[PDB]
Amino acid sequence: NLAAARNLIQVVTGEWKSRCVYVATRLGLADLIESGIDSDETLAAAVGSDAERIHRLMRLLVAFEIFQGDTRDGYANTPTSHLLRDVEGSFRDMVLFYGEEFHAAWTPACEALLSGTPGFELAFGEDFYSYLKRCPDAGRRFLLAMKASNLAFHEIPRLLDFRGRSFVDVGGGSGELTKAILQAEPSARGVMLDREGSLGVARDNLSSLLAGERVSLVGGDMLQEVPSNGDIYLLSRIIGDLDEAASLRLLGNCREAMAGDGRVVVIERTISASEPSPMSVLWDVHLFMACAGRHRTTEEVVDLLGRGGFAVERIVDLPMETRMIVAARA
């Protein structure tokens, strides 16, 4: 009952820790501190607070190993708080977006789980993808939030050998996975496929790589055709939105288009059918809350790969509860 009350209270009050991290990010404390503004007084002066309130917020965060030090010798960053800094590749924009849009989305979680309308849609009056287009700047902020998952993408070219290979990023969106591969392995060449008229974001995000002729963009419908003669076909976050049939159209398109000995690589969160990792299932509820998305089990994807003519060769756990499943032609 004691351990149980203590664990329960941790979970109940976890939200207040999220808020405190969000406030530390909004206030730019991690930046100020790295700069040497590192006392209660100087921090309070910089952000417009009071020294005692800063002291209390800092005491909390330090106790949870987010920052370190004290007001007298000075506060400093820890590996976790460095991620809050306003620097390339940090988690700052993800923290802010999650503490704003997704904080609002998770407020009507009860009515969402009862009705089946995502909490996001209840909170904002339109579906998520609609919101990113409507609400001014939301799209830009969300792409910055998503850069946080360059964590999994940076691992792919460390696990998979792209040296002298051509790859096809099917349904690439902004091009972050293509970008990460091409940054890591200079002899690799890619094609990114997306809907015609959808290539603008990628044209800008990939401008230097396009200028260097390391990549080309193609407009097309992946269900009708994929760019041919690739060695590796990346399906990143594609399968989850597709039903049995469209998934088999897509997989058949890659199976027939790829070079001899080519591979299909599915990159996606999948849930272990038994003993799922607690974080993977938290992401799964979140996918509902955000957009009524649904995850497959690892088994369902492996079996789906088989029905599309592939033999799985590797299943690798990536950062942020993402899997990489590599399949060759059966």
Place this chain on the structure above:
Amino acid sequence: NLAAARNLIQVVTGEWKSRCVYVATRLGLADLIESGIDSDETLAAAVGSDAERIHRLMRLLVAFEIFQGDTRDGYANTPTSHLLRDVEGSFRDMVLFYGEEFHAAWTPACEALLSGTPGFELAFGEDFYSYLKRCPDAGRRFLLAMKASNLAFHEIPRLLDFRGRSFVDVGGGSGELTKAILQAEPSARGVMLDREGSLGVARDNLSSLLAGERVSLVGGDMLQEVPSNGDIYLLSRIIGDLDEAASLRLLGNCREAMAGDGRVVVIERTISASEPSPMSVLWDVHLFMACAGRHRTTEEVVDLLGRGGFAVERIVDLPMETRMIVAARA
């Protein structure tokens, strides 16, 4: 870097777990399950949801050891989920209040820590205790939420001997501490003091014990006078709100009123000034967010006791980050 990123995401997404437990609580899943309604399908029909959403919620809660089992063989409670049930001493009402009023309070946390206006006041346009006194239903719910802390009160008569002895509950409020003592030790006798005109709640909450003539109530100002000849003077969540001057008046009132070899017993959350427990400091920021209160360090309480002519005899760590400090006449 992997490890830091995994930690940050845990903290950032912790809020969604709080929302998931709040939802299970609002829906009465633990009650339903205890009564044998224990599949996704029967749970869904019971609450007006759908089997798939229940499945995903329950998968999440089970993975975090809140419930156990599975839809086929049936879900079942755990020591943690038993605390959510609608039973006398559970955390159920605390979870609900924290997921409603305090979830609202913690939304403007940034503006709160900058301005100094508690998030509760920002959110509701009204200070916390004014809100409780004005809105009888909110006041009722808050009292039920504060019952979760009866965990600490029930330990008190196990650590102190009230057999044969008399106590004075100074600032007793609704009277839960007095009631915990008399229920544990039927031969204890006690007086509860509070401000005249405030005794309504306690007169009701303690009706039985008042009818048994085991306890009486007195209306009065503790800063001028306290009931005399007590063996044990309980100061529960009373000093925290008092300045130096007021605390020394109260302590002197106790020192002069008490029996030979009497004790003053301070029950309060305090912060260890050197290496504080992360949970104690989270409670401290929450106290600000709710009503601009704050906790003292343990050292400050010990030093204040000494200034009031007391010597600390014992310090005991009670449940839910609360301290019991026993002092005798120096």
